[PDB]
Amino acid sequence: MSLTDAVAHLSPERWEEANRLLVRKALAEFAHERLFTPEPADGQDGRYVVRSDDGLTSYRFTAVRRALDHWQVDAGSITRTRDGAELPLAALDFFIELRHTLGLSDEILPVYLEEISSTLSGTCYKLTKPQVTAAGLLEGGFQALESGMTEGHPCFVANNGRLGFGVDEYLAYAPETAHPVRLVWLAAHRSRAAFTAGAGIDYASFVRQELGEETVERFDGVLRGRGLDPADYLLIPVHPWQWWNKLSVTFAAEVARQNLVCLGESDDEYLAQQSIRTFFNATHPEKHYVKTALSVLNMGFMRGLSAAYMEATPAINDWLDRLIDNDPVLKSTGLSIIRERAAVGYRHLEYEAATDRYSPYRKMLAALWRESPVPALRDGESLTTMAALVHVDHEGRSVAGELIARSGLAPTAWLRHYLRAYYTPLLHSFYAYDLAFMPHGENTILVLKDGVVQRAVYKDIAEEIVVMDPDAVLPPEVRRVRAEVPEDMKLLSIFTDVFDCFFRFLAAGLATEEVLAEDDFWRTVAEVTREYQEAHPELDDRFRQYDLFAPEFALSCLNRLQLRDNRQMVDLADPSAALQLVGTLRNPLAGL
Amino acid sequence: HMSLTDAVAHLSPERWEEANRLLVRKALAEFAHERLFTPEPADGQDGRYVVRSDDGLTSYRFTAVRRALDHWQVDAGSITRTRDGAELPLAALDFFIELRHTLGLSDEILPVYLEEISSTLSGTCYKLTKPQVTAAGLLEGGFQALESGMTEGHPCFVANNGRLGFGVDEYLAYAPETAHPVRLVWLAAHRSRAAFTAGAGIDYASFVRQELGEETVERFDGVLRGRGLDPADYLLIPVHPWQWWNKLSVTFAAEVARQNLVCLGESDDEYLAQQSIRTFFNATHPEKHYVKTALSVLNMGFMRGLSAAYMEATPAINDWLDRLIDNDPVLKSTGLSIIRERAAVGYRHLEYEAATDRYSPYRKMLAALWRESPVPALRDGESLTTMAALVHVDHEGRSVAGELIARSGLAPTAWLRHYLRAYYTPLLHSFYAYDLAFMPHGENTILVLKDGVVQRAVYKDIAEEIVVMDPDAVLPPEVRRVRAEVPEDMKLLSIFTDVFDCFFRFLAAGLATEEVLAEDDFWRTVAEVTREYQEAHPELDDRFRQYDLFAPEFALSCLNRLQLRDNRQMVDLADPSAALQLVGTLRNPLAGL
C-alpha cells in the first residue's frame, strides 16, 4: 500500500550486495562465453583481471577454474580500479564500460540496463526475506522451495527482469514474494475463442471440477443478465497484470462488443511459479496449474502464450504420455510428464490482420491447464523443482548437499539415483526417438523420498519439445514439433542443456561444498551413460554417430543470444540459426 | 481501488458503437482535408460522397457540407460501410486496416496506432457515461468544469487521446476527463544529480514553503534525518504517481537504493490533471502553482516526458518574454500575459546519459516545473476558460462560443473582434515585430471572460514551444537556444497553419453550422482586424509585404500525416521544419477581403 514500504527493500547495503553478486556472475559467465579472457594476474596465482572497453577501468578478482570452462569467481575478491583508485561495484557502470566488448547495441543497452536494474531490485527484495537453510526449505515443502529459490536461470545474467511490472506489481506477482494471486476470469465468445480438450476431458465437467458448480452458475448468471447465452462463451483465466494493463485497453473493442466479458476473480488463491506466468493452486494443490499469457519481458522473450498453438497442445501431451507408458525403458526410469490437459485460445481477427505470424500481438490471450504432481505422491514422497539442487543457502549448504546428507548414501550412489531418474530418459529420448526437451531446473520436478530422487517429472512440453527428424512418423496433431537440425548440432540438446547449462553448476557446487569432487561427478555421469548404452546394442550405430564421449563439443553461448536480441533471443522459425558457437569445450566424459 | 467490472463498465456495445461512428466521421473529415483520400460523389447524388478501401471492394458513403480551407463537415449519422453488396458495422479498427496503405501505416506502426485508436475510443466511451452538461452549464461550473468537460481533444488529430501506458485503472485515476483528484509523489533528490532553477525573484527555501507549508517541509526533512541524511544535500521533485510506480521506482532503482532519490510520500493538496495530462492544477489551493511532471506515456505523436537538461533555461526564457511583453505597448494594449514557468527541477541520470544520445526518452523521465496560476489576477466578474472551449459543442448543438455570444448581447462580429484583439493580434505583432512564433492552439491558450466577452488572453507552455525565427537575433545567453532557421516560404505558416487551418477552420465552420455567424462574416472580421493592426504600424510595411497574409493561397500543412509516418516522434526537435508534409495549397479566405 505505502509509497515508502514498496521500495523499503531498496537500501544501500542490500543494493551493494546485489551488485557484487551480479558482477561476480557477469565475470564468471562472460568469461565462460569467451566474451572476454581474464588475463592471469600481477603476480598472484589464482588472481585475474578484466578491463573495460577503453582499458582504464580494471576488475580484478580471484577465481577457481573447473570443468567445462567454469569460473567460480569469489564475490568478496572483486575490486573495481581506475587511476589506481578503488571505485564502488556498480553493475550498470560495468555494462556501459563493456558495451562494445559485449554485443550491446545503442538500441538494446538502455533496455538491458532496465533488466539489470530490475534483477538487482529482486535480489534486494530476496535479501529482506527471512534466512532459510536448505533443511528449512525442505521442511517448508514444495512451494517453500519454489518461492525460496533465489538465483533463477544460472547462465543468464539478466535473468529476472520481469519488465512491465511496476514496483507494486513486482511485490504482488513475483514468485519469490509468494503473495497469493486471484486470477481474472473472462467469458470469451465462441466466434473468437476455442477450447481444446486432452483425452478424457469434457469442457462442461472440466470447468465444474476446476471452478465449482456454484461459480460456474454465478458466471452463467452474469452472462444471462447481460442478455448473453452462456452456451456461446468459454472461460479464459487471465493474469491480473495482463487484464488491467493490456487486455482492458488493447482489447477494448472485444470487451465493449461483449466478445469478452469480465466475470471477476477466482475464489481459489494461486501462487506464481518460477516461470512467473504459471500458477499453482494454493487453496487446492490437487487442481490444475494455470498457465497464462503475460506480456512481460523476461530473459530473452516476451512471456505471452500463442492462441494458435493451443489447438494442438493437449494432443502433443497425450502422444508423449502414451509414448512413455508404452516404452519399458522410460517406464523403468519412472519418468512422467504432468500433462497440459486443456487449453483455450482467443483469435483477435483485427490484430492478426495487422501483424504477421511471429507478432507478440497474437500471444496476448490464451491459457492452458496442467496436471498437478501432488495427488500422485505416495507415502513419504515430496516434490522439489530441480533448480533446488543448485540453490545454495546462507550457510553455504546446497539443497543437493542436504539431500545427500539426509539420505545416508555415498554421494555417487545418491547422484546415480538422480541421473537415472532425470538424465537417462533424455538419452533414450534422443537415441530412440530423436526427441529433445528444454530440461533445465525450472522445467523439471523431482520426487524425493528418504532424501533420494525416486523419479523425475517433466513439464512445459508442447512449447518446447522437438523431434529432430523431419520425416518422422507421427500423428498429424504432433507433426509440427518436427524440425531439421544440423547433424553436428543434434547432440547439443544433451551437451548444452544438460552438461554445460546445469551439470556444470551442480558439479562445481558439490566440489566447492566438499561433498563430491568433480572427477567423481563426471565419472558417475559416464557410468550412467554407459549403463544405458550397453543395455541397447541395437542402437550402437546411433551411439557412434552421436558420440557422447567425443573429446570436445561446441561451446554454445547463452548470454550472447540475449545480448544480441533481448526481445527475442531465438527465431522460432529457425532456432538453430540464432545459436552462437564460439570454439569448443573439453568434454568431461572423454576418456571415461 | 475499485471493482474489476466497474472499471470497464463504460465499455458497452452502445457507447462503443457511438464512439466508432464519431471517430470514423473525424477520420473521413480530417483525412479528406489532408488529401490522404479524395472523396468522390457517389451515383451523382448531391452531397453524397464515397471513400473506398485500399482494394476498392469496401465503400464508405457519407454526406458532407464543404466549407472554407477544404473543411469537410461529415455528418456522423450518414456514414455507411458497404462491401460485397451488404452493409457492415462501422469499426474504426477495420477502417484503418482496410486503408493501411492509403494512409501510409507501415507494418511496424499499424498495431501500435490501433492501440492508440482503441484507447481514444475507450475514452470517448467513458466521456459518454458522464452527466450531460450544456455550454451554459459548463460556464456555470467554472474553470475546471470546462477543463474536464472538454471532449474532442485536438481537433485535427484522429488518434489524439491515446495516453498509451495507462491501464484501465490508471486511466480512471489520471485522465483529465475523469477529474479525479491526484496526490503528487514527492522525491528528495541529491544535489550531486539534481538542479533547482529559479526564475526572477524565487528563493528555493521560501518557494517550497509557500507551495507546501512549513509543516510538510519539516516533515520531509524529518524523513531524511530519520534515514541519517542531511536535508541541506537534497532538493524536492514532484512526480506523477504513474511515473513513480511504473518507471522511476524500477528504471531508477539504483538511484533510490543508493539514496540519491528518497521517496518522501504524498502531497496534502489535491491536484487535477489538465488537458495535457501531465500538468496539474491545484484544486485545494487554486492560487498555487500548476505542477508540470514527466510522464513517459505516448500521446498524440510524442512521449510526454520532460527534459531535465532543458529545465536550466526554462524560467529565464519566461522571464525574458514576460519583460518583452511588459515593455511593448502594442502587446500591453491587447492585454496579453503569460503564466510564467517560475521554477524548475531536473535530475541528471549520469549512467543513462552515458548510455544514450541527447534525444533519448531515458533523459526525459525525471523533471518538473511550477507555473503561475492565472486565478489571483482575476478582477471582479472575470472567469477563466481554455480556448478549446470555443470549439466545444454540447449535446444540444450549442458551442461555448455560441453561448458566450448570446450572453454578451453583442453582435457576433463585435464579440469576435474582442476575441481577435485579445488572442490573434498579439500573434501578428509577435511574428512581424519579433520573428516570434508560439504553439497557440486551444490547449495552450486561456481566455479571460467578463459579461460573456473575451477581455484578454493568457498564453502558457512557453519555453518548450516558442521559436525566434532569426538565428542572428540578439538575446540573453539562456534564450539563444530558441532561435531557429525556418525557410522563408514557411515562416508565415506559424499563422496560416497553427491559427487558420488548425483552429479558425473549426471555429468558423462551427459558428456557421450553429447559425450564429456566416463564414464570410467571420473571415471578413479577421481580415478587418488584420488591416487594423497593419495600418496602425507602417514602420513594418516592408515585412507586411514580405510575409503577405493576404496571398491568394498558402501551403496545406498536414498534421495527421506526421503522426501516421512516426507516431512516437512526429517531428525531430533539431529540425522541426523537416518533418512537415506540405501537400498542395489552400485558398486563403483573406484573399478577397
Ligand SMILES: NCCCCCN(O)C(=O)CCC(=O)NS(=O)(=O)OC[C@H]1O[C@@H](n2cnc3c(N)ncnc32)[C@H](O)[C@@H]1O
Ligand atoms: N536448445 C536450447 C539451447 C539454449 C537456447 C537459449 N534459450 O532459448 C533458453 O535457454 C530458453 C530459456 C527459457 O525461457 N526457458 S522457459 O521457456 O521454460 O522459461 C522459464 C522461465 O522461468 C525463469 N526461471 C526462473 N528460475 C529458473 C531456473 N532456475 N532455471 C531456468 N529458468 C528459470 C526463466 O527466466 C523463464 O522466465
Ligand SMILES: NCCCCCN(O)C(=O)CCC(=O)NS(=O)(=O)OC[C@H]1O[C@@H](n2cnc3c(N)ncnc32)[C@H](O)[C@@H]1O
Ligand atoms: N508550426 C507547427 C506545425 C504543426 C506541427 C504538428 N505538431 O507537432 C503538433 O501539433 C504538436 C501539438 C502538441 O503536442 N502541443 S502540446 O505540446 O502543447 O501538447 C498538448 C497536449 O494536450 C492534448 N490536448 C488535449 N486537448 C487539446 C486541444 N484542444 N488542442 C491541443 N491539444 C490538446 C494533446 O493531445 C497533447 O497531449
Ligand SMILES: [Mg+2]
Ligand atoms: Mg518453462
Ligand SMILES: [Mg+2]
Ligand atoms: Mg501544451
